[PDB]
Scaffold this active site. Structure first.
Site, PDB file in Angstrom:
ATOM      1  N   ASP A  35      26.085  25.870  57.052  1.00 33.91           N
ATOM      2  CA  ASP A  35      25.249  26.552  58.039  1.00 33.91           C
ATOM      3  C   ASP A  35      25.895  27.885  58.402  1.00 33.91           C
ATOM      4  O   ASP A  35      26.807  27.924  59.236  1.00 33.91           O
ATOM      5  CB  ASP A  35      25.080  25.691  59.280  1.00 33.91           C
ATOM      6  N   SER A 199      17.426  44.634  57.912  1.00 30.39           N
ATOM      7  CA  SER A 199      16.574  44.887  56.766  1.00 30.39           C
ATOM      8  C   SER A 199      15.852  46.215  56.946  1.00 30.39           C
ATOM      9  O   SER A 199      15.548  46.639  58.067  1.00 30.39           O
ATOM     10  CB  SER A 199      15.579  43.734  56.614  1.00 30.39           C
TER      11      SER A 199
END
Length: 330
Positions: A35, A199
């Site tokens: 994770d 992004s």
């Protein structure tokens, strides 16, 4: 040193991925959910409330000659999906794919919430976010990667998750045969303890690319791709009959649909998520309403590049003094 371990989807939907981890002496092998969105290595154990164990493999510290109670240490964690667990802490030897850390904090669950009990395939979590998020008190503990870093050939790990197929986590090296083209690296902020990056934009299907900064986290422990409501609406508007359902808890679409791809930007590079990766199947057995793999982050507080996005790429988690993330097509 290096390590290399195969990671395997837990079910036919890629809801999560499990990777075998050796704990203790002699080894006890547990299948953990790696994770990158959390920083605790915790396991079902001989200490877990018996009514909360249902098929998981447990760690028994009393059977490990290298286990030592970390006296006074406790832990307690809550995840973005509302699940939780807590317990006490041992140190022990932990190996992943041939890479061994001695003295790793292994957080033994005394209590786990229902979603963990109900998932017999996940024996615990191995956190790979920054150690500043580790919940052990009163002495915060280091992640497996942080403990291994100095010994690694290169201070990196990579995630190469498969679509409906096994993939690989590598530690300490970049397998140049595992991706196509070049790796594009992008800056990371550790201010929230996550692999947080920006992004450069998105496209839906064959549509034109929209340049727009989208801050989010690379999170292997989250199944879906969670993005701003504007972006998610633009995506689902291209699917006839798709709608956001408050009763279901997100966007659903007719199972008869063919989904468009979704592209996200990494600097000047582009990662394409095929439409099939966005199909999470019937909302309930036999339903013709299917659950979408791109959902709004509006209720979370952060955008999350979960498995739907990450499995379309070869992803480098660069833990150099200034951390960065790398993405390549594959």
């Amino acid at each position: 040193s290096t390590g290399s371990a195969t990671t395997t989807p837990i079910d036919s939907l890629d809801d999560a991925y499990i990777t075998p981890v050796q704990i203790g002496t002699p080894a006890q092998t547990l299948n953990l959910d790696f994770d990158t969105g959390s920083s605790d290595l915790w396991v079902f154990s001989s200490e877990t409330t018996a009514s909360e164990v249902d098929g998981q493999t447990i760690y028994t510290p009393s059977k490990s000659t290298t286990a030592k109670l970390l006296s006074g240490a406790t832990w307690s964690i809550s995840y973005g999906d509302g699940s939780s667990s807590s317990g006490d802490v041992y140190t022990d030897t932990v190996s992943v794919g041939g890479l061994t850390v001695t003295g790793q904090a292994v957080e033994s669950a005394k209590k786990v919430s229902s979603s963990f009990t109900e998932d017999s395939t996940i024996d615990g979590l191995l956190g790979l976010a920054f150690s500043t998020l580790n919940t052990v008190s009163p002495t915060q503990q280091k992640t497996f990667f942080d403990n291994a870093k100095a010994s690694l050939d290169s201070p990196v790990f990579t995630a190469d998750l498969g679509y409906h197929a096994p993939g690989t986590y590598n530690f300490g090296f970049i397998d140049t045969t595992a991706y196509t083209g070049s790796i594009t690296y992008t800056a990371v902020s550790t201010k929230q303890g996550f692999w947080e990056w920006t992004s450069t934009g998105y496209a839906v299907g064959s549509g034109t690319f929209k340049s727009t900064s989208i801050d989010g986290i690379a999170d292997t422990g989250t199944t879906l791709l969670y993005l701003p409501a504007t972006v998610v609406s633009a995506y689902w508007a291209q699917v006839s009959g798709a709608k956001s359902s408050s009763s279901v808890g997100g966007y659903v679409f007719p199972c008869s649909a063919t989904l468009p791809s979704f592209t996200f930007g990494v600097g000047s590079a582009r990662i394409v998520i095929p439409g099939d990766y966005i199909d999470f199947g019937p909302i309930s057995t036999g339903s013709s309403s299917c659950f979408g793999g791109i959902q709004s982050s509006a209720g979370i507080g952060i955008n999350i590049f979960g498995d739907v996005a990450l499995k379309a790429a070869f992803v480098v988690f660069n833990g150099a003094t200034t951390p960065t993330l790398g993405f390549a097509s594959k």
